[PDB]
């Protein structure tokens, strides 16, 4: 019974509760990368890169 | 019964509670990378890199 | 019964509670990398690098 | 300027986040009172009682 | 300027995050009172009682 | 400037994070009172009693 694998879980998020409460949020970039506020993110990859919250300035 | 593997878990997040409470958040980059506020992130990769909250300035 | 492996867990986070409470948070980079505020992050990788909260200035 | 009272707050709830996740919830009373699952409830009373999640068995 | 009282707060709840995660919750009373699961409740009373999560068996 | 009282706080709750995680919770009373799971509760009373999580068996 090759791979009779029952209920697995891979790359799962469940049961999250969040409260963000600012008064003056502010972002100001010049020529670069910015990544904020990522929340409750899942993923599964096969035979490939798997970045999630990446941020790169230049590439040459 | 090759790999009769029952309920595994791989790259799982569950049961998170968060309260962020600022008054003046502020981000200001010039030519670089910034990554903030990542929360409750899961992932599974097969045969590939697996960065999550990466940040790189340049590449040459 | 090769690998009759029952309920494993690999790269799991569960049951986190957090309260951040600032008054003036501030980030200001120039040409480099910054990574803040990472929380409740899981991952599993097979045959590849596995960075999570990386930060690199340059690459040449 | 008798009672130039500016922006007060009295009996206020704001900024709530909740995740309930059961599999078999069950309630079974016989002749009594039950009160469950109350959430995010505000109130203001003037010259009178102010119960919110009360529960009484008998009165004679 | 009698009572130039600025932004007061009285009976306030704000910024709550909750995750309940059961598998078999169960309640079973016989002739009495039960009060569960109260969350994020505010109140203000003037000239009167102020119970919130009360529970009484009998009254005679 | 009688009572120029600025931003007071009275009976305030703010910035709570909670994670409850059971597998079999159970409550079973017979003729009495039970009060569980109270969380993040505020109140202000003037000229009156102020119970919050009370529980009484009988009254005669
Ligand atoms: O049956 C799946 O194939 C396995 C993976 C895989 C792959 O990635 C690329 C490829 O060229 C071949 C390949 O054969 C794998 C395999 C798994 C076995 O259990 C098996 O008996 C077999 O003959 C051969 C499978 C299903 C999936 O759902 C999965 O996520 C996964 O990673 C794999
Ligand atoms: O059955 C899966 O294949 C295994 C992994 C794998 C792979 O990655 C690339 C590839 O060329 C071949 C490959 O054969 C693996 C394998 C596992 C066995 O238990 C097995 O009996 C077999 O013949 C051969 C599997 C399923 C998956 O779901 C999984 O996540 C995984 O990593 C693997
Ligand atoms: O069955 C899985 O294969 C094992 C891993 C693996 C791999 O990584 C690359 C590859 O070329 C082959 C490979 O064979 C492994 C293997 C495991 C065994 O128990 C087995 O009997 C076998 O013949 C051979 C497996 C499943 C998985 O879910 C997993 O996460 C894992 O790391 C592995
Ligand atoms: O102006 C409000 O009257 C106050 C309360 C009150 C009451 O409860 C019953 C009653 O017979 C009389 C009464 O006079 C109160 C009062 C407050 C003063 O500041 C004042 O100068 C005055 O002459 C007299 C008021 C407004 C409200 O919005 C309020 O919530 C409150 O509790 C009260
Ligand atoms: O102005 C408010 O009246 C005050 C309270 C109060 C009451 O409870 C019953 C009552 O017979 C009279 C009464 O006079 C109070 C009062 C407060 C003063 O600052 C004042 O100068 C005055 O003459 C007299 C007031 C407003 C409110 O919003 C409030 O919540 C409060 O408790 C009170
Ligand atoms: O102005 C408020 O009145 C005060 C309280 C109070 C009361 O409780 C019952 C009552 O018969 C009279 C009464 O006079 C109080 C009072 C406070 C003063 O600062 C004042 O100059 C005055 O003349 C007289 C007040 C406002 C409120 O918001 C409050 O919460 C409070 O407790 C009180």
Residue numbers in the entry:
A (entry chain A), B (entry chain D), C (entry chain B), D (entry chain E), E (entry chain C), F (entry chain F): 37 to 96
List sentences quoted exactly from the publication behind this structure:
Abnormal aggregation and fibrillation of α‐synuclein (α‐syn) are closely linked to the onset and progression of various neurodegenerative diseases (NDs) such as Parkinson's Disease (PD), Multiple System Atrophy (MSA) and Dementia with Lewy Bodies (DLB). α‐Syn fibril is also recognized as the key pathological hallmark of these diseases. Hence, targeting α‐syn fibrils is crucial for therapeutic interventions and early disease diagnosis. These fibrils are involved in a wide range of pathological processes, including cell‐to‐cell transmission, cellular membrane disruption through mechanical forces, and the triggering of neuroinflammation. Given the significant role of α‐syn fibrils in various NDs, extensive research has been conducted to develop chemicals for either binding to the fibrils for diagnosis or disrupting them for potential treatment. Moreover, we used cryo‐EM to explore structural alternations in α‐syn fibrils induced by two chemical compounds, EGCG and CCA, and correlated them to the potential mechanical changes.
We first selected EGCG, which was previously reported to bind and destabilize α‐syn fibril. Using surface plasmon resonance, we confirmed that EGCG binds to α‐syn fibril with the binding affinity (KD ) of 2.88 × 10−6 m. Compared to the apo fibril, two extra densities alongside the fibril core were revealed. Remarkably, rather than binding the interface or pocket alongside the fibril core as commonly observed in the structures of α‐syn fibril in complexed with different chemical binders, EGCG inserts into a shallow and polar groove formed by residues 39–46 and 80–83, which is close to the N‐terminal of the α‐syn fibril core. Hydroxyl of the EGCG galloyl ring forms polar and hydrogen‐bond interaction with Lys80 and Tyr39 residues, while the hydroxyl from pyrogallol ring hydrogen bonds with Leu38, and hydroxyl from benzenediol ring hydrogen bonds with Glu83. Therefore, EGCG may interrupt the salt bridge between Glu46 and Lys80, which is pivotal for the stabilization of the Greek‐key‐like conformation in the apo α‐syn fibril. Furthermore, EGCG forms a hydrogen bond with the backbone amide of Tyr39, subsequently perturbing the interlayer hydrogen‐bond network within the fibril structure. Thus, insertion of EGCG into the polar groove may prise off the protofilament and destabilize the entire fibril structure.
